[PDB]
User: Fold YSD1_17 major capsid protein from Bacteriophage sp..
Amino acid sequence: LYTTYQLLEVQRKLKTLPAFFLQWFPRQINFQEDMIAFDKVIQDVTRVAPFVAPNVQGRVIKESGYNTKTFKPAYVKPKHVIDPNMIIPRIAQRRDRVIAYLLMKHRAMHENTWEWMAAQAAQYGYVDVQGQDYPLVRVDFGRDAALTMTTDWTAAGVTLMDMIADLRDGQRLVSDKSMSGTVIRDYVFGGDAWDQFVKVGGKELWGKDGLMDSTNVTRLWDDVEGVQYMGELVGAGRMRIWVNTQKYRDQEQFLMKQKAVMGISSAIEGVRCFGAILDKGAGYQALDYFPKMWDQEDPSVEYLMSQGAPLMVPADPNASFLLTVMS
Assistant:
């Protein structure tokens, strides 16, 4: 058998393709107990108590909800049988090879969970997660309601100057409503919003005198399917244009709202928060993922399990906006 330390050496050694939305969640807190403290994350002294309510059949049950300074994150726990005879696309040598593939698959399950939690927190200001007594609960971080907009880019006589002004309103509202007052320079478009912005913008956007300047965070996405850096939109305020068409799997959905545009700043200063994983003898383990191997009977197999308890909390919930453009 291998110790957690030995399994972490393997699990952590390789490089994994960059996460798009988490680039705005650079900070990290590995909490010492089972609870996450928002007072140690959220900047706004009025917004340090997010509203947590059960999400039952899509509907948020606000009645049985409360404001809380502290949260108990549910464990993300992939568990797989270690079969040395397992089919891997590329005796003890093969056993180790199986463990490493499984550890990589587990690390991916945790990493993608962080990314989708980042996507939801940044886009909506709230994240739907697994609860303690309910299968799903909503953690509302209280982003200003003016930062969730609606417009119709499919209406008659809409121009590129009108579309940029919708985007600019959003960044000016962020400047007004955010702690820092940061000027947004990044605009993540969903695929339908982008196609819409290009349907209307055409000649004025990509032509001989286009606004798009198509010419090192912008080049790390070349080999990433779903992410496309389009260039800076030159304005007499040079906007960075991102298009996100990434999909993930639910027990397959789009990471970014396809018919919307999200504006975001580095001032969101999102924090990857992690609860400590309780271990019988070793006590609490403050880790992002925690691999454990063991032999058992009933069934007579060897198991590998990577446990983690995450939440992606924004420091400044008001440092981003979402603008829906179609229906």
Notes: The first strand starts at residue 27 and ends at 30. The two ends are 54 Å apart (CA to CA). Residues 145-268+317-324 form a domain with the capsid protein of prophage fold fold (CATH 3.30.1930.10). The CA atoms of residues 114 and 312 lie 7 Å apart.
